[model samples]
Target chain A: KKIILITGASSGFGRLTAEALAGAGHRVYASMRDIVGRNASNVEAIAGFARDNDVDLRTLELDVQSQVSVDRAIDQIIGEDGRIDVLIHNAGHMVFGPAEAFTPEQFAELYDINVLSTQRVNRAALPHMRRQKHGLLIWISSSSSAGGTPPYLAPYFAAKAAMDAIAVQYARELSRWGIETSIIVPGAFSGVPDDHARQAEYEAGPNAGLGEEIKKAFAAIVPPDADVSLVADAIVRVVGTASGKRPFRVHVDPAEDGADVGFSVLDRLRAEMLHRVGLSDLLKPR
Target chain B: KKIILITGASSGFGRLTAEALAGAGHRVYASMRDIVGRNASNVEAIAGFARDNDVDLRTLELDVQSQVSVDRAIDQIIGEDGRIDVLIHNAGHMVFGPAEAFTPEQFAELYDINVLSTQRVNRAALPHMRRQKHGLLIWISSSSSAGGTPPYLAPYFAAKAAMDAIAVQYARELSRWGIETSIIVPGAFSGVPDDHARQAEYEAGPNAGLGEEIKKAFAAIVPPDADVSLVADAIVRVVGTASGKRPFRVHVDPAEDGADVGFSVLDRLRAEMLHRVGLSDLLKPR
Candidate 1:
């Protein structure tokens, strides 16, 4: 059994991931935003998993977006396990709006979590991952990084795209460190438990009504087919594996299996043209 | 005839573009880097075009990569013509090197020309373009900016890719100003006049040893099939139009019709996947 720590376990994908790994008999830690709010039902479920599978489930207060929180959690993990075998940067947040309308501060804030925060985490844990000369770094991203996104969501796309660029660059930079990094593009994992409420919160944010034209142009994105369990399982399987060959990217949407005609043509043509022009190798693992 | 200025006219695409535009009855400002004592045949071609086509070919001294020179040249253009209808940022310098071994400074310096210097030119001319409410800004770039590029020229790709991202951002940002911007991704032009010698000069610069490693990694991307005439013709087509529906991209590859496989997949996937997953559309063009 591999030792693993999953962030954002209070709800959604993180919660499912924690449970699944625990059932599979791993030393799984469910990291949540507020550990002090440990209520009966949640605690019972976590403890039940621990009892049934002998897979220890501990709730650690960790928010990947925060430096202080990440540091504290790393310290706790190091204190217990001496080292972390793999890091799944699965915690993410989103706010959609037109690019021109987004305040520079909001853009900066997104970079804080969606981009720079990832770098900070890597920098913090890299020394350990490097010392071991063996570890995996997984980035939970969106197909939007490469796909055409809604106009109102340019900022979101920019953030994701920047991270995608950074992911490849970092992968090349860190490969010599004996660490393998991968980007997982999960298209619209539905059932965001509190999204409607969250949408209300976003609309209430500053300059909410600034992008009237774009908002009227395209409706906000809301994913429906969300099965958090599959995402969790996928994350676990990749992290626990011992191999030098890891897919640089994983697109989890059912359509990723090449169901759509237009998408198939796009991929095939892009692949064909890229190779025809002698550029296909540039995008592959270095 | 709309007033237009193009740089790198001493030879190769620059000289040919100068003649092509001159023959098209447009007032072409021909710029040469070392006009005093360099290649004479290209200069003769410019003169011949001026006489035969009744074209106003004004030869000027401008080094596109030099900040001082570009500013002075644009200042002269604005002073003489009272406005610059189209500014073709066609000048470029090449460097081939591995990404990991190149210093951040090396990468930054290249951006000064391939990216920032272009920005400098755009900023210098934006006032006039905006005042007219009908001006075009075109950058003759490489296919590498689309994300797949040769390995030996990672720095070039980084600089060019940064330019690509920023150019797209600016196209959206500046659209409301009526100052249209488009990036031309010309798939490998023929090895210009002294490419081998020029490559050697570049190799003698910082990160000199990068050439051998890059050569071993991937085939050297000489100039680009794209005849200078083809590129110039495309430019004339874009400049002659005043329609508000200006395109954000143009690929000058004779091979592919700029079929936009990348954009298609990106847009199609977002629309299809978002809809299938019951999510609102994630794209909203600004």
Candidate 2:
């Protein structure tokens, strides 16, 4: 069984993926902040599943915003496993409102949690991964990264786009070191109560008139019965595979929003661009 | 003549656009971080140009990273002109080397200058733009936003991607206010000496080995004869025209890397996705 660490495991995709992977008999370290406080039930629930099934699922305290906490968690993980074979970067937050309504501090916070957190975890984990000369990083990204979504979610979309770009670059940079990176692009999913609250909060704000309209537009854009399992399944499938065999990106969307199509086109253009620039040799497997 | 404010006017595209716009008889407020200090020469040159040529170029000490400074500059400009007809966001920095080589703080700083600065300027100016019910925002972006380029420029590309996503969102949101937004996508330019210094600094850093390869690869990828005027001329052309006629994006690349073609396809897919989700009406001119 591969040693795996999953972030934001307290709920949603993170929690579900942690459970699914552990059920598949992998050693899973589910990470989140406030383990004994806000996420105590999640901790108990996953631990109970592990106990009953005799699986290796443990909880680690990780505040993605705190570099200190992130460093501590990854150090602990390496100390135990001697290495992390798979890292599922699933931690992120959402913001709903007119882009103008949010402050720079708000956008920066979103950037910190969603975009910068990936770097923090990578920083802590890369040395061990590099030493082992192999690793897999699966980023739980969004279709919104494709852009041209409806209005009112600018900050969140921008943060995700930033994450998306970095993920692609990592796939190129890390492959030489025998590290594999895959970005899982999941379309909008329903059943998150936090999202509902955020939507309500903005619908009552200063831009309520336009905010409400945009909210309605978003709901109409995303499938009401969207499932999160598509992501968990992709994560399970991609892990434990040969580094060179893994696809750089996987999209899980019922709407077929054409993100994959765009990625295919852009991917080719990128290859052609690199070849023209005399870096085609670098793009090969090391 | 319209009143315009351009950021990063102390050098490069910012400086050229400032001079071009002022020469066209617009009341141009060229903003840079330091007017009397680090960027004093630029300030003096632009101010001297204004005096010698009888142009309306005025230098303003506006740091895009500081909301207070941005606020003060916009307040002073509006107080003087009664309205700011245009805002050109051009202040940004570049980071080279592997994505892993940079610290989180380094990445955060890049995001602040390149991505968050746009929001800060938008917040400071949007109120005025919305109130006047007529304004144009021109974002100076890069072809790197297209992604699929060579490796080693992760943070910069991520920041630009973030900027591109938000610029598109702003276009949709601001249209109802009779405000216009246009993103100017310029490919790599050859005339900036600052780029050479930054490249040299990184080549001597910790990742110097891989850094050199990436640098050589970059030199091959970018056209050696790139001109900054392509962007400056577009800024001048897009401004002063009817809002309805302004394109949401303009690419000033002679090599033609297919960014425009990809954007067009994605733009249409976005419309189709919105239609499927019941957001087509919201996509209306409103």
Candidate 3:
């Protein structure tokens, strides 16, 4: 059985993914950001079920947003398990706000959780992966990342788009060393994303009245992501598939859910135009 | 006319490229790390020549390795020029030695110059690029970086290879955002690399007896980079032709020296292996 590490495992897809993969006999390292502080009952239940199922789905305290926490958890894993076969970068936080309304500080805060945090986690995991020479890195990005959607949540979209770039870029870069990176593009799902929703609720709580308006807008314009289980299943398949069959980008969607919307195609095109003029290889194939 | 900034401009490609581009009618920002300390005869000549040619190639103090320097230089450019059309990531240092012989600190320092500095410069320039939605970021990387011919200078190889990855990855990530990033992979040319030679002289001292050995090793193991003018020309072309016909990658070899080392067999095998592992995109298209 393969050994894998799954981040954001306290709830939502991360939690379900842990049990599903563990049931399949893989030794899973389920990581949660805040267990004691947040009272993650779901995480505790998953830990219990893993024990009963005769599968290894151990809990690890991993906060991808925090460099210290990420390092500590990874160091522990390397010390105990010797190597990590797969790294599921499922940990992320989402912030939604109009482009004009977002302060630079707010943007920085979101980037810290989403983009920069991914960098931190990758940096910590890379040394171990380099040593192993054979491992997989999976990023859970959004399908709403592409152009087409109106700029309702520009910050969220930007963060996810950045995540997509980092994920794809790492895939291309790490390929020579026998490591493969895949970005899982999940279309809108019904169930709340635990990490993102928590952040939104906590941050937007003082302005609770504003939440109603945002919710109405979300209901009117924002399409819900497809079922979380489909994403979980895709994650499992990608993790266990043989080297010959692994895909670089996986679009996790069921037949009824249709395909992911290329959320902001025009905006993306404009950005590409700017990047070209800037002599930027922010998105070139190696 | 395009406005460009070339980092590490005190000597080597940045300085020469600044002069070359400025002479060709583009406004150039020639940035040197040690403008105050050094006898800037070369820069003075370039400035005079630029003035005579009715082009602008102003020198600024910029050390790409420092975020503070990058930020300040970019701020000054934006203040004066109102827009920066191109950014040439030509600044780098090559550290040669057995990989194991160097401490982790040494390795990190190499990355600081070659990899992280690129990031710092790009990040500083991104706001301006995004605002204009038009710019070029050309990375000056070595040609044999992708092909492994390693016996000595693993650190140098590693850093260049890292830049290649950054260039490719950023191209993919930022291309859709109007930022075009191209890596100018120049083959060895016969000339003294001022930075490397100067550093060697510092290490060797007045009585350093191994000058011949350093020269031969640089010859046997590493080929010389092309004329600084050739690389500068390539950078200018890369930035100009970025839109209509974008080359995913570009190779700049010296004139009339089309020697091939017959690495097709190794290249083929590597390509096949990458293909087998579902990562053929990592290999460059020759």
Candidate 4:
């Protein structure tokens, strides 16, 4: 039996991971994005997830993106167990920048915010996982971090890059101390760029209305039957795997963006080098 | 016929790029980092490169890492021919962190400074490049940005991620406006992580100095005859290519770190999507 915590549980995989994990005889916490006043709607939505299952679960108001949100969640919502065997970080977010049309301040903040958010979440949970000396930290990563992300979404891609790099660093350090980290990279989902007048410069330029066109192209080829739940299933699988045997990356790509093709070779080189260097112990959870 | 400037030209590919570009008759400016008091020796080595190639090249004292350095490099060194047809960003440097033993502030600074350094360079040069409406910005990105970097060098990989993302954003935004961008990714090198008291925790632990073993492994397989000059040749090819036909990425990996293998597929998908959206104009320079 496992005690799991899932963040950003307002929608998407958050809802999916909670139902799947709890249904499998484990205690799961689906921490929705409860930003103080915006509570009425989220409570009912989170309530719907608990409607069907009567096993083991609760909803928390933890917005990892905000500082005070995390504080209250730990202060008020944390359980008696005080043992998080698995912490599934399912937060996927970014602000839109119209390429370089957005200021450098905006760009610096894009990277800065991502780092701060990670540190904030880890600050809340890492000590627990580190102290437990036997836990798994699963993060939801974007496919764009590695391969095939188009323009006008630079901010999203850049944030994903940092998150991905930080995830690897965590795995290398923590796995040596009996803590495992698995990065769930869900790939090839149809998406968008946020609004600002600056976007018009690219979307309404010689490449007029490129925004809608690219969005449509991604939506078109993605078969209607391809469920987003596969991303949820990937996390579920990662949670079920044996502690020390879990994979470093569980890539779930419905539209197939070639994200995994080269990482296979690249990751092999890193592992082989670690093995060659007698740090093979660091490659797996102790 | 291009008037080009190369930064961090004191060693490695910076030297190779300057020597090769100057050898090819471009008026190349290799701005060696004249870090205040550290100028006596760099001046002699910089002059020797000038002595061999008689065509046209000058050494500038621009340390892009600092504000005062860039100001003097432009004020004291700017010539009558202010039209810089090319600017090669070859600044690849990073301080090491011992896994997670380093503080969060160190990690945040890593990403912050990379962004600041980029903005600093662009702030100084972008106005001219933007106005000229016909120029190329060739950035030296690492293969680790895309694939195959071992652990303990988290800071370097993170910085490369930001630089690589920024390069693509610059390309998408600038290429449409007639400024070209090409990222030169050189892969498969022998390297090491920097030191701190914290490093002792990892190296002196169960793993026991895995650092030296890994470096030796990379060195052993990287063939003694592997020519680093191939990276220089890739840049020369980019320079020689006709306007609007230059490659977006010129990847040189003599030791083969699996960089370009999948990027070919990934970049193709991005371009095809742009074409599908009638933004094919962005796939190349205007």
Candidate 5:
């Protein structure tokens, strides 16, 4: 059985993917923060689901925002299983409202939550994976990172773009060590602005109600029958595809937002650049 | 003459763009840190060049990392010239090493310099520009952000990609206020990693000296005839273009790295998404 560690498993894509992975016969450690506090109910629910389903779905108190917590979680995983096979980077926060209305600190926070969190997890887990010369990093990216995007979600989109770029680079860098990187670009998301004054200012301006209008339009783009589980199912398919055979990326965007098409060009040209550089070996797991 | 502000103008595209903008008959405040310290020689050289060229070029101390410095510089510009017309975000740093070797703090540092710095500058400058209802933001993006990219430049590419995404979002958000946003995606550049131990680890491993090899091959692809000033020239052309008529982005990658082509598809689809949302008015400066 594969040993998988997934961040932000308390809800949404993380929760669904964790359950599906455990169901697929992997020992899945679904990690989240506040396991004994605010998210206590989520922990209880996950335990009940695990018991009822008779799956190896366990919850851990791991907050990606803190390196200490992340390192501790990685150590626990290593102490339990001695190796990590699959790393699902699924923790990310989003925000709405105008970009100008958000503060620089908020931008940094979004970048921290969406991008740097992965870097921390990598630094903590990569040593073990490299020692074994085997690993897979599944980045839960958004279609907004590469595809059609609406307005009022600047910081979130920016962070996702950065994460997607990092995932691409890591894929190349880790490939020679037998580690594979696969980006899962699912479509659409949300968040809120913390700057009340700036938010109020925008509400009083011409862009007032524009964010909500954009949100509804964004939602409309995803037809009513769209299933979020398609993303989890995509992850399942990637994991099931034999090692080194998984696609570099999988698009589960119900909206068909064109991220797949955009990434096709981006990734091909990127791989071509490496080929030109004599680093083609980094393009696949060795 | 336009009162233009360009950050990190001590060297490279920043210096060349500042001098060229001045030669083009604009009042250019070329902002960089350490006016009378480490970069004092830069100030003397710029002053001599300005005097010899008979251009209205001046140097100022404005560290994008410090909001107070950014706010003070904006204040100084408004005090000297009644209005600030063009704001150029050209400040950025890079790194060369395995993505695994880079620290989380380093990634955040790169993001702050390359991406959040724009937020800092924008927050200080946008209020004034919004008041005038006629302003332009020239974001110095990178082709590696949207084009073919080699390994070892992961963090830099990540930050630039984030910067490009933000520029796209800001274009729409600022358009309704009669402000224009033009992104300048320059190709291929340089930086070093501070993690010597990790660098040594990679060197001792299978990927030893792979970074240097990648660098040489990367340089080989750039024909000797490549002119870095093409980026500066593109910025000049964008600034010279009539308000509300400038292209949303200009690529100066001499390597013809295909960022222009990739971004062409990405941006068109992004624009189409906006059209579907009935916010096409925000697509152009209104």
Candidate 6:
């Protein structure tokens, strides 16, 4: 079984994917922000689940915003298991509202957590993966990065787009070293605990004029019954695939948001462009 | 005549577009960093050319990296002219080499200058445009933001991708106020003076192992005779079109990269998505 580490395991897709993969017999290290603090119960629940199921699922403290915390957790994982075969970047934050309402600092904070944190984790994990000459990175991306409509979540969308861009670049750059990447483009779901809180925050803010309209539009785009399990399954499936068989992008949306059409066209054109540049071989894993 | 403010007019496409728009009878303020220092000659030359050609073109100092500088330049323009009919976001920076080579500080700097700087200028100028109830924003975006092949320019491409995401959000959010945005996706050109300098810097840096290969790939992608004038002409043409008649995205690439095709498909899908969300009316200018 592969040794896999998943981020943001306190809740959301991170926890689900960690459990699913561990249940399937992988040694999983589920990471989150606090173990003895705010997320103590989540830690206890996952630990109890691991105990009851007799799976190799260990919970670790990893605050992605802190570089030191990420380094420590990664080092501990490598120290225990000697290597981490796969890293699932599933941690993300969402802000829903008008673009003009947020300051540059606010946007930067989103970038710090959503985008820069990915880089931090990569920095901590890449050296070990490179030494082993093999690794896999699964990016939990959003369909909003495709420039889809019903636009009110500007800051979060921008952050995800940045993350997708970097993921593609890393996929190309690290292919020679046998590292692979797959970006899971999941559509919006209704049950995110932060959605209601963020909506309330937006309605109370200065840009509340369009808050109700945005809420309705958001609801239309992502119905309440959308499944988070689709995203969790996508992660597990991609992780189970062989290195060369993994796609650069996979869409998981109950609404069928048509990201696949755009992704297909762009991927083909990008292949042609890379071929013209003499880097076509790098697009595929070695 | 429309009052237009263009940034990064010291060199490259920005300088060309500023001259073209001014010659077409628009009152243009061509802004650059260090009007009295490093770019003094560029400012003097443009001012002289304007006088010789009898065009209403003036020069302002706007370092997009600094909020103080952007606010001062934008305030002065609005203070003198009472309105800015168009704001051309042409200021950009490019970084080459392996994505892993740069430190977090370097990447953050790139994000600040290429992405956050757009927000800075927008924040400074949006209030006036909102007051006037009509404005157009011309974004000088790159085809590399499409995440195509030839993958060494990671940081810069990620930043531009972020900029494009935010631009579309602004386009939708400001449509109710009669403000419109057009993103100009220009292909790479070989004539950029800074291209050679950036390549040299990358080669001397720590991650120089793949420098030669990257340089060759870069050269193969961009022919020496690629025209910068095409982008300048595109700016003029789009600006002259009626607010509601202009396309959301325009391509100035002679290479005919598949960005146009992908963009077309995605735009249609995005429109459909917007209609589903009851935001179809807001997608077009009011």
User: How many pairs of residues collide in each model?
Assistant: 18, 1, 58, 0, 1, 0
Q: What is the lDDT of candidate 2?
A: 0.79
lDDT of 5: 0.88
Task: Please give the lDDT score at residue A97 for candidate 5.
Answer: 83
Local distance difference test values of all predictions, in order: 0.58, 0.79, 0.60, 0.70, 0.88, 0.81
Q: Could you tell me which residue pairs clash in candidate 2?
A: A220-B277
Candidate 6 has which clashing residue pairs, if any?
none
Worst 10 residues of 1 chain B by lDDT: B277-286
Q: B1-286 in candidate 1: lDDT tens per residue?
A: 8788876667666677777777777788987666666746667767776877777888887765565777788889888999987677776666643333444344445545565555556645665675676677777766654424334554455455445544555454455556667666676541122235434433554325544644543333334443557776776677666555555566676545234555444435545544543333222222
TM-score of each: 0.58, 0.91, 0.51, 0.82, 0.98, 0.92
lDDT value, residue A276 of candidate 2: 76
The order of the candidates by TM-score, greatest first, is 5, 6, 2, 4, 1, 3
Using DockQ as the measure, name the better of candidate 1 and candidate 3: 1
Question: Deviation in angstroms for B100 in model 2?
Answer: 1.3
Superposed model 6: Cα runs more than 4 Å off? A190-209, A221-224, B190-209
TM-score of model 4 relative to the true fold?
0.82
Docking class of 2: medium
TM-score of candidate 3 on Cα atoms, chains taken together: 0.51
lDDT of 2 by residue, B110-207 (tens): 88999889888988888787777778889988777773466777788888888988887877777666777788888765112233443444355332
Tens digits of per-residue lDDT for model 6, A41-96: 99999999999999999999999988899999999999999999999988888876
Question: What is the C-alpha DockQ of each candidate?
Answer: 0.10, 0.59, 0.03, 0.35, 0.84, 0.53
Which candidate tops lDDT?
A: 5
**Candidate 1 TM-score versus the reference:** 0.58
lDDT of 5 by residue, B31-50 (tens): 99878898899899898999
**Can you rank all candidates by lDDT, best first?**
5, 6, 2, 4, 3, 1
Docking class of 1: incorrect
- Which model is ahead, 3 or 4, in terms of TM-score? 4
